Design an enzyme around this catalytic site. Structure first.
Site, short mmCIF file in Angstrom:
data_model
loop_
_atom_site.label_atom_id
_atom_site.label_comp_id
_atom_site.label_asym_id
_atom_site.label_seq_id
_atom_site.Cartn_x
_atom_site.Cartn_y
_atom_site.Cartn_z
N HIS A 69 57.97 28.44 50.51
CA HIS A 69 58.04 27.06 51.07
C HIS A 69 56.65 26.42 51.15
CE1 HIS A 69 62.14 28.44 52.29
NE2 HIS A 69 62.43 27.16 51.94
N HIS A 73 56.45 24.39 45.66
CA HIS A 73 57.91 24.12 45.87
C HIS A 73 58.14 22.62 46.00
CE1 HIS A 73 62.07 24.41 47.15
NE2 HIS A 73 61.78 23.79 48.31
N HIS A 107 59.85 17.17 51.70
CA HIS A 107 61.12 17.66 52.32
C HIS A 107 60.93 18.97 53.08
CE1 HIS A 107 61.36 20.42 49.07
NE2 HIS A 107 62.37 21.03 49.68
MG MG Z 1 63.82 23.09 53.74
ZN ZN Z 2 62.92 23.04 49.97
#
Ligand code: MG
Ligand code: ZN
Ligand code: KI8
Length: 314
Positions: A69, A73, A107
């Site tokens: 993350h 990504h 995000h």
């Molecule tokens: Mg997420």
């Molecule tokens: Zn994600």
């Protein structure tokens, strides 16, 4: 600006248009790749270069050095959204084109490598501030924070109206990345598509469709060439197993997916995920938006590679 077109080397210029593009290991080229995509997807006019660059670099700073993350990504999920938008030119509003690449880049802002579940069992303050979609309300919060830094307002030209609309696209797009919400979103879409009630003029329908695009882009490591897919799974599980260790420290047996003592069960776990999540996601997406079919085809290719892993054919 504004006669200042970003260009990529020839191999990247061509392959960046394809759903299965890998952004590569050269971190310093990722900002350049994103601006390229915004320019082609939205226009050289939608954002002030100086502000856009400043925003991208603060977003980057606010991603953490976690195995999965991370900033890579962020840019990977934005590249899948870029491929969807560029294959469905005429279906999207000017505000949607603007907001969705930004939503994708933001995000997972300030992700710590732990699920909403772990935050809830740890009793993290974020879980008290946000009872559902905990990390996703946090990610949206971090997005607004960064938009509000001096010289970071990339939306400065929009009216009051268009500004509230674009920040509402971004909020809904980021909340939708909560996989707990994916299952009912996709069930409702599948029913709407089959009874022929699906109406892209219904704002509430568009919302669902952008939700599904967000899940598709977010899971897009399963749509890559097998060596990319296989090596990303290692990063995914390195986070899962750390979380599992942290569960054991709270005195809680983690689910097997997160138990590093159950590494053997990974290939069977990937089958479940492809069958229960990934395949249904790209299937319904390809029904609504036929030109996204390469994502479904690449997903099915990777399912079949995990079947080969189980059969010891690798
Ligand atoms: Mg997420
Ligand atoms: Zn994600
Ligand atoms: C019964 O399942 C549920 C039912 C209702 C609500 C929530 C769930 N959970 C579903 C599972 N959950 C996950 O996060 C994910 C699990 C896996 C596995 C295995 N591989 N990848 C993955 C991701 C990205 C790329 C490739 C592989 C993921 S992402 C959490 C929520």
């Amino acid at each position: 600006q504004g006669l200042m077109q970003f260009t990529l080397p020839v191999r990247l210029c061509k392959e960046i248009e394809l759903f299965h593009f890998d952004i590569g290991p050269f971190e310093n080229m990722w900002p350049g790749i994103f601006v390229y995509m915004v320019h082609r997807s939205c226009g050289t006019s939608c954002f002030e270069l100086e502000k856009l660059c400043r925003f991208i670099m603060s977003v980057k700073k606010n991603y953490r050095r976690v195995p999965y993350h991370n900033w890579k990504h962020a840019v990977t999920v934005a590249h899948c959204m870029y491929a969807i938008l560029q294959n469905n030119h005429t279906l999207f509003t000017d505000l949607e084109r603007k907001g969705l690449l930004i939503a994708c880049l933001c995000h997972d802002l300030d992700h710590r490598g732990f699920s909403n579940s772990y935050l809830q069992k740890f009793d993290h303050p974020l879980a008290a501030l946000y009872s559902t979609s905990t990390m996703e309300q946090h990610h949206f919060s971090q997005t607004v924070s960064i938009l509000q830094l001096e010289g970071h307002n990339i939306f400065s030209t929009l009216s009051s109206s268009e500004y509230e609309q674009v920040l509402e696209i971004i909020r809904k797009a980021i909340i939708a990345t909560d996989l707990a919400l994916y299952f009912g979103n996709r069930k409702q879409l599948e029913e709407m598509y089959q009874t022929g009630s699906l109406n892209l003029n219904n704002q509430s329908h568009r919302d669902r469709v952008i939700g599904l695009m967000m899940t598709a882009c977010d899971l897009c490591s399963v749509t890559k060439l097998w060596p990319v897919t296989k090596l990303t799974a290692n990063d995914i599980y390195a986070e899962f197993w750390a979380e599992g260790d942290e569960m054991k420290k709270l005195g809680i047996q983690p689910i097997p997916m997160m138990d590093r003592d159950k590494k053997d069960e990974v290939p069977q776990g990937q089958l479940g995920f492809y069958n229960a999540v990934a395949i249904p996601c790209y299937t319904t997406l390809t029904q609504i938006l036929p030109p996204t079919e390469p994502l479904l085809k690449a997903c099915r290719d990777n399912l079949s590679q995990w079947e080969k892993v189980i059969r010891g054919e690798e």
